């Protein structure tokens, strides 16, 4: 979607080489706005929101209202065209599917991960959208660790670096005895 909306200004990034530049622009200059409709109003008038990116060949391209429009798709998937609700409503739909007595510990323990959740200001937007969706009585706490991009790898690294974990691995002997089905019993 960023590649599609950058051509609206005149920047034609179509090849795989320019796709890496588009990804770098998305990683370095995109951010989730607290209010999309209100932010667009100021972006259409103010000029301080326009940033400047340096292409590998030396060209300096300017990006305007595309900083918040690209990550806005995660909450409004109508930008891409999928009918599925945004990441702010699928979370609520999944929480309402569990037990009724454990829903309270799920609203106040929403954890975000992955490289896509690294946009500055996504936790506030998620909290606002859930508080709009969730009942008013119960509170929503959204925690976002600064290392959520590689948290899934850091967890595995710490779990494998344990001095008491060397006996929990699946050695080749147990595999030879039990076939590939050993992973189901061990894990």
């Amino acid at each position: 979607y960023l590649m599609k909306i950058l051509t609206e200004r005149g920047y034609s990034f179509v090849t795989t080489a320019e796709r890496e530049i588009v990804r770098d622009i998305k990683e370095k200059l995109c951010y989730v706005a607290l209010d999309f409709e209100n932010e667009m109003a100021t972006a259409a008038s103010s000029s301080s929101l326009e940033k400047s990116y340096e292409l590998p060949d030396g060209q300096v391209i300017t990006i305007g209202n595309e900083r918040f429009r690209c990550p806005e798709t995660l909450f409004q998937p109508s930008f891409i065209g999928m009918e599925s609700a945004g990441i702010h409503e699928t979370t609520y739909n999944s929480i309402m599917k569990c037990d009724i007595d454990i829903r309270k510990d799920l609203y106040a323990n929403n954890v975000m991960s992955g490289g896509t959740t690294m946009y500055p200001g996504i936790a506030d937007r998620m909290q606002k959208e859930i508080t709009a969706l969730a009942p008013s009585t119960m509170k929503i706490k959204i925690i976002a660790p600064p290392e959520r991009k590689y948290s899934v790898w850091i967890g595995g690294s710490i779990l494998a670096s344990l001095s008491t974990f060397q006996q929990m691995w699946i050695t080749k002997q147990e595999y030879d005895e039990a076939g590939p089905s050993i992973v189901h019993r061990k894990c």
């Binding site: 660790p145 290392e147 850091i154 967890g155 710490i158 779990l159 344990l162």
Partner: peptide, 11 residues
Amino acid sequence: PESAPLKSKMI
């Protein structure tokens, strides 16, 4: 707490 290092949280 969140101020603790990850090595003490994961364990």
